[PDB]
Amino acid sequence: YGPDQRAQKKGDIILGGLFPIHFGVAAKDQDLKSRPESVECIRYNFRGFRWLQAMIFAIEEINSSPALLPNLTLGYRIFDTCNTVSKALEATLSFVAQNKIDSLNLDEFCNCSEHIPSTIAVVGATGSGVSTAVANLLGLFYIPQVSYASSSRLLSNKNQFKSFLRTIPNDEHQATAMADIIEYFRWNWVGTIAADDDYGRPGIEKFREEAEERDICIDFSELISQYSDEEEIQHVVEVIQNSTAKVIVVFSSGPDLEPLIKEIVRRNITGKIWLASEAWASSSLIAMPQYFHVVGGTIGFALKAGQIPGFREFLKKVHPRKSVHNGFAKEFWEETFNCHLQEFRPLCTGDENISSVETPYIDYTHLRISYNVYLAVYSIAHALQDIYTCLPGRGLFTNGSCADIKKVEAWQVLKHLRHLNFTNNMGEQVTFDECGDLVGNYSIINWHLSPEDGSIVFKEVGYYNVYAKKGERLFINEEKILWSGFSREVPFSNCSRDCLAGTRKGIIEGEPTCCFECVECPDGEYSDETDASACNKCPDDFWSNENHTSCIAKEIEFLSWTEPFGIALTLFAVLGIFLTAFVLGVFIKFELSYLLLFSLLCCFSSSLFFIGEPQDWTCRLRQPAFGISFVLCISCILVKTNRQFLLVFLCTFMQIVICVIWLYTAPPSSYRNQELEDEIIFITCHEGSLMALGFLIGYTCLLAAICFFFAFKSRKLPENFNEAKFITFSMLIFFIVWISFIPAYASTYGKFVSAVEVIAILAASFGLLACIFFNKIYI
Amino acid sequence: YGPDQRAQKKGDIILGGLFPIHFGVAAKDQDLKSRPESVECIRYNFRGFRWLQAMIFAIEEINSSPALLPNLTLGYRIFDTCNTVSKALEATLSFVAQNKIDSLNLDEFCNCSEHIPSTIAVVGATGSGVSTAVANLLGLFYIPQVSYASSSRLLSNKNQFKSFLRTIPNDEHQATAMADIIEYFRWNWVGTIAADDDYGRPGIEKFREEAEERDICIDFSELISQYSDEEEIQHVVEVIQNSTAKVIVVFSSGPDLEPLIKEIVRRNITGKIWLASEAWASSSLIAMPQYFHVVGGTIGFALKAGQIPGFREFLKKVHPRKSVHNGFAKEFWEETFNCHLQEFRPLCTGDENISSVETPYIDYTHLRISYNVYLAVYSIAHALQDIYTCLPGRGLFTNGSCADIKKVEAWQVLKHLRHLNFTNNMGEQVTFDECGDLVGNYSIINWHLSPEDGSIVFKEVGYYNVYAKKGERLFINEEKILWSGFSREVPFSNCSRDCLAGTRKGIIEGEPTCCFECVECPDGEYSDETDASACNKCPDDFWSNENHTSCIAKEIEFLSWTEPFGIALTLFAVLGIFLTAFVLGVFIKFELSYLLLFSLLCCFSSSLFFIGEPQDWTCRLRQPAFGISFVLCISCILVKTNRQFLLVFLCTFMQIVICVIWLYTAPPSSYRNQELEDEIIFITCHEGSLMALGFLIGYTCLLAAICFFFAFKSRKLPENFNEAKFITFSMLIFFIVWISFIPAYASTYGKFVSAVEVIAILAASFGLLACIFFNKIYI
Ligand SMILES: *[C@@H]1O[C@H](CO)[C@@H](O[C@@H]2O[C@H](CO)[C@@H](O[C@@H]3O[C@H](CO)[C@@H](O)[C@H](O)[C@H]3NC(C)=O)[C@H](O)[C@H]2NC(C)=O)[C@H](O)[C@H]1NC(C)=O
Ligand SMILES: *[C@@H]1O[C@H](CO)[C@@H](O[C@@H]2O[C@H](CO)[C@@H](O[C@@H]3O[C@H](CO)[C@@H](O)[C@H](O)[C@H]3NC(C)=O)[C@H](O)[C@H]2NC(C)=O)[C@H](O)[C@H]1NC(C)=O
Ligand SMILES: *[C@@H]1O[C@H](CO)[C@@H](O[C@@H]2O[C@H](CO)[C@@H](O)[C@H](O)[C@H]2NC(C)=O)[C@H](O)[C@H]1NC(C)=O
Ligand SMILES: *[C@@H]1O[C@H](CO)[C@@H](O[C@@H]2O[C@H](CO)[C@@H](O)[C@H](O)[C@H]2NC(C)=O)[C@H](O)[C@H]1NC(C)=O
Ligand SMILES: *[C@@H]1O[C@H](CO)[C@@H](O)[C@H](O)[C@H]1NC(C)=O
Ligand SMILES: *[C@@H]1O[C@H](CO)[C@@H](O)[C@H](O)[C@H]1NC(C)=O
Ligand SMILES: *[C@@H]1O[C@H](CO)[C@@H](O)[C@H](O)[C@H]1NC(C)=O
Ligand SMILES: *[C@@H]1O[C@H](CO)[C@@H](O)[C@H](O)[C@H]1NC(C)=O
Ligand SMILES: *[C@@H]1O[C@H](CO)[C@@H](O)[C@H](O)[C@H]1NC(C)=O
Ligand SMILES: *[C@@H]1O[C@H](CO)[C@@H](O)[C@H](O)[C@H]1NC(C)=O
Ligand SMILES: *[C@@H]1O[C@H](CO)[C@@H](O)[C@H](O)[C@H]1NC(C)=O
Ligand SMILES: *[C@@H]1O[C@H](CO)[C@@H](O)[C@H](O)[C@H]1NC(C)=O
Ligand SMILES: [Ca+2]
Ligand SMILES: [Ca+2]
Ligand SMILES: [Ca+2]
Ligand SMILES: [Ca+2]
């Protein structure tokens, strides 16, 4: 009853089932001026009719085989939901009629002797919003509903849907797989579009939750339908164009993506690559070659293919007249042949060949959902069989007491369906869990343009083994994948391009983390990693490179030990010591010849003890550069004509005591400074307050000025071959050297602050020897 | 029929309605050993019973008033959903019994003469998952459903729910308001918890979508229920503790938050402040004083209060025996008095006062949902009235032909309900939109502990005017708000604390943007803003401060024009020029007295033309510092005893020609360098390759060495009061000055590179005058 397009056949036990023979209802709206009448469905679904044939086929095979349910035939009242909740509820109200005794005891019947014998288990409602509406109704009467293609996670909530089983995997696996795919191809900037019903809406929440643990931040999320208006589709495609994310994850059904794909190919937005949900990844409404400019190379999902024998030929035996138990065969025939059956459109002969025309009823490669229909009706049969072969004292009910077959109630069938364990034709075990659902392995496909009048061929490119460990479930042989239909390289789909190791990562205010900016980091970068969030700081021994990479450029080594700018001065000091030694040999062969020889050799020989890399000892050894000059300058008070003569310890020991007092004041320690940036490693010996200044002013600025005060009366006086004038010239030369020393010493640094001191000491020690020894020898 | 707990009363036209008298069903599960029987509901809902009384009250008021629907009474079969889809569907299958003629024509009736006269409009199903299940069923028969409290956005989809109206606002406004609240108090780190049904699940998607335009990034999102297990509640509160976000947005119903609040107060997680959805913001299951340690100061939402007169006393007239048309009064009485009515628990007298005991049936302040029930049944009445007062040729149906009253069908009532326009007792217009829903203004509340044996008082702290402009809808008088029950300052709820203007903002890899890190930025920060994402670069005139704030510290001004380190040298140059001028006056009073006076005055007077801030002219004027010395050094070849004498242009004009050739080689331009970092603004005049070196070696290193070659025979020769020896001493002094000049010039910079040149020039010009003029005068 109810609708007048059934597929009815009697039996001892009647199943019943629901199928999408059409695609939706007529788009006309009731203004409710007249009495509102039944809406007509509009498009036609050959794949849905094939699914109906798959249910019918297994019913006939069970009824023919005596090895399963003998002496007992099965019936079916298959209705047709035109993919809508209203058309589904119209049918499943006629399912529960003889069951309407419990609450409404006012049934009275008065309509049939068998009173429309009760259905025992419905099969289906492919739509997930359809099954949610039907299972609310069939949970009052505990009739088991075995869906074949409704696959949302809301239906696995057994406090509300108390009688619901399904032979399709849940969608907590598929939304994980579409996160693992993006994690495998390494994108981080995607977009989501879901159908606004119970298939896409809770299926995209799982994807949003499971693509934030992998930090794939999502650009946009928009909801579509199949009854949306042009402003909504406009808003959606403006969001699509207005963003830059090439990977779009569409979690939607077949005919709900149709108004979006129509509009996008009408506006020619080429470039986006679509991940596909399981519903429309193999869909004859989107797999059209005129759409291939935009939809191409879409990575999809499909369930594991099944094998049904003889079903291919059972499909061929269809006829509008020969099928008495099939109300849909006629409208199928006149749809596939554009006829008009009699009992614009030509009248139909009724002898046509179905394999002539091309239609998705028979043009197919793999049984996927038809296998699930087949498995569902076999599972109902095997639960009935395990009711049929139960012995007393062994059953599943109270006190082990099982029940009969001829008076069987639906809750018993549900009880035996919960504890099911049986084997396929493909030899696999089939069990429903505590939430009543199979688990299977998806087979990832890819849409290819078959270039010999073929519309679109689906090339299998991998799988997704849900049985394996987490982290390793996804195997993609990615040699076959033609991104956007033709290409071979993986398209870029990040938000910002990952820039190099010269820079760190800086951000934009109010934007997701998957796109950034990158700015170079200065003065000690050592930015070693490729996508560092903050480049490090260089260690104190090194300085950053030109291109700011890892700092192996180290600091300075300013010592000047064997440098060619100091080796010549070392040679000059050696020649000065040797010129002192030859004069010593002449003055030995042929106290003023002893002390003013030895100390004058010492002040010229120990001057080379301050060139190179300093330390504690070589930094404390700069006070003998005053002490040896103090002893060598005793000639100016010892060799005068107005000369007891060994009393030079009146001032030399005073200088030694001042140096001993300054050894605590100024340090015996070389100190580094960092005055430049890159090569600024120095050593400068850090004279404390005034120690060297006081020593110099107490010895060398005093001895020459005292000798000038005594030889101011001797410079205009010849004595001992003009030794007075020669000593006055030597004192003036030493005063000139110490006048040249001071500001050039005070204004320079590092390598060039020891070189001036050693040059001044060599100048004094060479001058005091040359103005004395040559005049004393050659005369 | 159906259930045996009705509230039934006859009438010409019967309404029917659904109400949550209990809170849920018994937690026992069917193992399905026996035949499964009807589940019993468990808790009791006094507020739900008050809502039922509010429906009954307005039905009696309409039936008493002759000014609305005269000569026509109204009936009602009010059932009770125990807040479940199954208990609702049991009732609304008994609603549609006489309507079951269209599809199932096998009704036959055979049960009643009037055949259970048809309901015309149901009222309610407060649960949004309950109304979604009922409205799928009542859209086949086009019965108008007027919900009073189901308020999700899925129900406003008129392709599927073709007959559904509601007198409660949608929840696209409330989820916007809870984003505007957080935007007003300026947090950016919140957490969301929603009930896993159709009230919280699509209501939190609107909040997630509308709190990313304001960049309030969400920490966690977890779904709860009321039939969840202890592992799930454990997982949720571990997520709550394990995070640091004090603002938690709970979008859930009354009894679904109960298992979470029980567990949280059992684990004493104090500190989180709860934003409240409209459902549980005024709920007698969560507003309990023992829970106040955790739930306190929760900002809530409530609908606009209504005013019903006499309803307070109509509630008082209740009795289990006097109410013949109310099956719930008995179980209400024995629940509110712990009696046991007869026809552990004491037997009940049946004379008790209801206002004695405290219960949410009568302990209330504002009618909120009861007003919506009242408005719903008045709206049904007024649509019936506008059917009743229609004239022919005027109606809303086809050809203007309206229909009668005595044979009225439900779709006509739906047609008149769509075009409704009527006025309240509070004088406001009530219209349903094209999606069939009122719009109202929420009144934001806050939970306060009434400290005189009061449980929890709800203090109104503002509103949310949805009629106003976007951006300005939310008014919170925030002087009343006690955060966490007692405090007064707004609690901090950001992810990272907003740090200061010394630093920029750096990020952590794999974390949301609402928390960051902040690192100081070096060497030209000028980080002026308070939360800059990247501090700027300082301009070329300035350098960054110590605390890296806005760089008003500028660069150097190294010129030394009127400095006290150059003013003394300016005084020395003026005294040198005056000492030249007095010798000029003496040599005038009492060519070697003309040229060697004027050029020797010029080389000492023009030396002050190179101290200060240089320019093009003052940078080109350093070649006369060679030219004037070249003319003043002609005395060494003009005043000799072996002296035609005006042939000084043999070398002075050669020097002038070399200077003219060098005026193109070396620039007449002062050049800046930046050798230090902070104060490094210099000007150094950038001598080109060798121009000044060639000029110096061609004039001053040549004239003295040529004069020494001629006076080597004259230094041991007195002539003209020893002028030869005096000129030899002057030439030696000039050679000493030029020997002191060179490396101290080559090794210094900036301010201290002009000071050495001007000192050397003053030393030469003072020496050549002092060794000549005094000896020529005093003799
Ligand atoms: C879009 O942005 C993605 C950031 O999420 C980039 O993903 C990065 O890819 C790198 C490889 O290309 C990964 O490097 C790997 O790091 C692990 C350490 O965990 C190493 O063992 C691997 O050897 C190393 N791979 C290689 C080839 O060296 C990054 O870890 C990964 N980033 C993250 C956060 O996981 C995408 O590369 C980028 N896409 C494009 C096209 O630039
Ligand atoms: C948590 O983080 C929030 C960031 O989202 C901070 O919000 C910031 O608050 C500031 C005021 O406290 C805002 O400054 C305002 O900026 C506007 C310019 O658009 C000016 O007109 C206002 O005068 C100015 N307000 C003041 C008082 O100067 C920031 O704009 C705002 N940030 C954003 C992105 O909107 C919260 O302050 C922070 N919470 C705590 C406790 O630190
Ligand atoms: C699940 O997917 C896996 C992977 O494709 C399939 O496991 C394979 O099974 C065959 C037969 O046992 C083995 O030869 C292969 O080695 C397996 N692959 C592995 C272990 O990686 C499996 O058939 C799929 N289906 C089911 C129901 O498990
Ligand atoms: C909506 O909220 C607004 C704000 O509280 C209410 O508007 C006020 O209405 C009264 C009466 O007309 C005026 O005196 C106030 O000035 C209004 N407030 C404004 C304009 O900010 C209004 O009553 C609420 N309800 C409805 C149905 O609009
Ligand atoms: C797309 O970008 C343009 C450019 O500003 C803007 O005007 C338009 O509103 C955007 N559309 C959407 C849907 O954001
Ligand atoms: C769309 O673009 C593709 C390539 O840019 C081009 O081949 C095709 O003709 C375009 N179609 C339309 C309708 O613009
Ligand atoms: C035993 O079985 C009978 C009927 O099968 C049942 O009524 C009884 O309750 C059972 N007793 C037990 C203990 O299981
Ligand atoms: C029952 O199912 C389990 C796993 O689901 C399987 O191991 C076992 O073999 C099954 N029983 C039979 C008899 O096949
Ligand atoms: C909470 O944090 C602890 C500390 O690492 C961790 O062991 C635990 O798993 C966390 N719990 C959750 C729910 O993340
Ligand atoms: C919870 O904590 C509050 C304050 O820290 C304290 O007053 C209260 O006694 C605690 N309760 C329990 C059960 O620990
Ligand atoms: C006029 O009204 C009659 C009955 O009310 C109806 O049958 C007819 O179709 C109407 N015609 C028009 C043009 O509205
Ligand atoms: C009908 O409703 C509109 C707004 O909804 C209002 O302006 C008008 O006054 C109403 N009509 C009557 C008669 O009140
Ligand atoms: Ca399809
Ligand atoms: Ca933003
Ligand atoms: Ca409540
Ligand atoms: Ca992360």
Numbering used by the authors:
A (entry chain B), B (entry chain A): 20 to 362, 391 to 637, 649 to 701, 724 to 859
From the primary publication:
CaSR is a homodimer, and each subunit possesses a bi-lobed Venus flytrap (VFT) domain-containing orthosteric binding sites for native ligands and a cysteine-rich domain (CRD) linking the VFT domain to the seven-helix transmembrane domain (TMD). Taken together, our findings demonstrate that amino acids and calcium ions act jointly to fully activate CaSR.
To address this issue, we purified full-length CaSR in a buffer supplemented with 20 mM Ca2+ and applied the sample for cryo-EM. After extensive 3D classification, three different 3D models were obtained, with resolutions of 3.8 Å, 5.6 Å, and 7.3 Å, respectively. The VFT domains of the three models adopt closed-closed, open-closed, and open-open conformations, corresponding to the conformations of VFT domains in CaSRIcc, CaSRIoc, and CaSRIoo, respectively. The 3.8 Å map showed clear extra densities in both VFT domains. The densities were located in the clefts between LB1 and LB2, overlapping with the location of L-Trp in the CaSRAcc structure. This observation indicated that ambient amino acid (or amino acid derivative) could have bound to CaSR, just like that observed in the structure of CaSRIcc. We then built the structure model for the 3.8 Å map (designated as CaSRCa). Structural comparison demonstrated that the structure of CaSRCa is almost identical to that of CaSRAcc, representing the fully active state of CaSR.
